Design a protein around this nucleic acid. Structure first.
Ligand code: SF4
Ligand SMILES: [Ca+2]
Length: 344
DNA sequence: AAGACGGGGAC
DNA sequence: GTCCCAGTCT
């Protein structure tokens, strides 16, 4: 019932679609940026970031020529920072290798970093009219309910099933609108909890509704870590900060020297870290910070800094009024908040 | 396959 | 507390 299902979906979309920032036009660059920002992040959270980001990097070239440091700063607070490292690399790739044009071929676009099966579909269908599926969590929930699919959507292969289903029922004449409509339906009507089936424009076609299990679908299947942070203040009013490893947790972000206490030593395993030496004091406050695969049990440790050598290695000396110039994870952002809240 | 990879806002 | 959001990479 593909064709008729398409008409209802698309009709609903025209009337109910939200006027979001990235929907002003279909510029490949603007669509791509928004799609990367939306990965595992809510629309409400993205809006402010997209606005600031586009103003600061209006074109793909402008973003390509920016120093990675400024690009990360623009992403400070969004989470999953590798998304922007990959988008930056990919954008630099399109400028030099593809003459500043976002490839319109799925095989070409999919080779760029950060571009997985979802983004290929979202960006190419929307910006170029390419008939590729764009299956995100929203679509998976929608399709799972419409076709009563009970396979664990956390299974790597379950997404392939959904992609095939989309290839069979999508409006090949307007793939972009079709894909977007499917996502919007999931965002506004066919919601995680208490979907609005009575007001759904494709209720008639829904097997989950007919069987009364809409709410039980889709079917879907952390370690603690103590950490000691050090905030060394130079009598001159400058602070010590280091850039993080280029690969792994919060990669390439700045932070206050710290170590995985892995117990309860505190001001011990830290001092040792010198690879330019000094001693600490007693804590100032303790909090926690969650991620997705692990939690941080960090405890701060202040101290004084006396110069005895050149600041090298990842480390970098910086005046207090310049900190707002670096990109810091949310955890360490709080560390500094509690510090000036202390010396207050 | 399954775990790494942020931060936040409903319920 | 729990879920999951416009997922990608190894
Ligand atoms: S009828 Fe209910 S479960 Fe089926 S697609 Fe609509 S909102 Fe989703
Ligand atoms: Ca790819």
């Amino acid at each position: 019932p593909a064709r008729e299902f398409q008409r209802d979906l698309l009709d609903w979309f025209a009337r109910e679609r939200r006027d979001l920032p990235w929907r002003k036009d279909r510029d490949p660059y603007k669509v791509w940026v928004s799609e990367v920002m939306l990965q595992q992040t809510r629309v409400e959270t993205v809006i402010p970031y997209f606005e600031q980001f586009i103003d600061r990097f209006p074109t793909l070239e402008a973003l390509a020529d920016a120093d990675e440091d400024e690009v990360l700063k623009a992403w400070e607070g969004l989470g999953y920072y590798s998304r922007v490292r990959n988008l930056h690399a990919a954008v630099k790739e399109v400028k030099t290798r593809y003459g500043g044009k976002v490839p319109d071929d799925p095989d070409e676009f999919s080779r760029l970093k950060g571009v997985g099966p979802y983004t290929v579909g979202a960006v190419l269908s929307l910006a170029y009219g390419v008939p590729e599926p764009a299956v995100d969590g929203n679509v998976m929930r929608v399709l799972s309910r419409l076709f009563l699919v009970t396979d664990d959507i956390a299974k790597c292969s379950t997404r392939k099933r959904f992609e095939q289903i989309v290839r069979e029922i999508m409006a090949y004449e307007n793939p972009g609108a079709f894909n977007e409509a499917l996502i919007e339906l999931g965002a506004l009507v066919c919601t995680p909890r208490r979907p609005s089936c009575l007001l759904c424009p494709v209720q008639a076609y829904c097997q989950a509704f007919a069987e009364g299990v809409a709410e039980e679908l889709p079917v879907k299947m952390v370690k603690q870590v103590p950490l000691a942070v050090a905030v060394l203040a130079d009598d001159e009013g400058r602070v010590l900060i280091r850039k993080r490893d280029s690969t792994g947790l919060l990669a390439n972000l700045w932070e206050f020297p710290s170590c995985e206490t892995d117990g309860a030593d505190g001001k011990e395993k830290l001092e040792q870290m010198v690879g330019l030496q000094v001693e600490l004091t007693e804590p100032i406050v303790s909090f926690e910070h969650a991620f997705s695969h692990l939690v941080w049990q960090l405890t701060v440790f202040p101290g004084r800094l006396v110069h005895g050598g050149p600041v090298e290695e990842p480390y970098r000396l910086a005046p207090e009024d310049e900190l707002k110039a670096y990109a810091f994870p949310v955890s360490h952002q709080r560390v500094w908040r509690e510090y000036k809240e202390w010396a207050s």
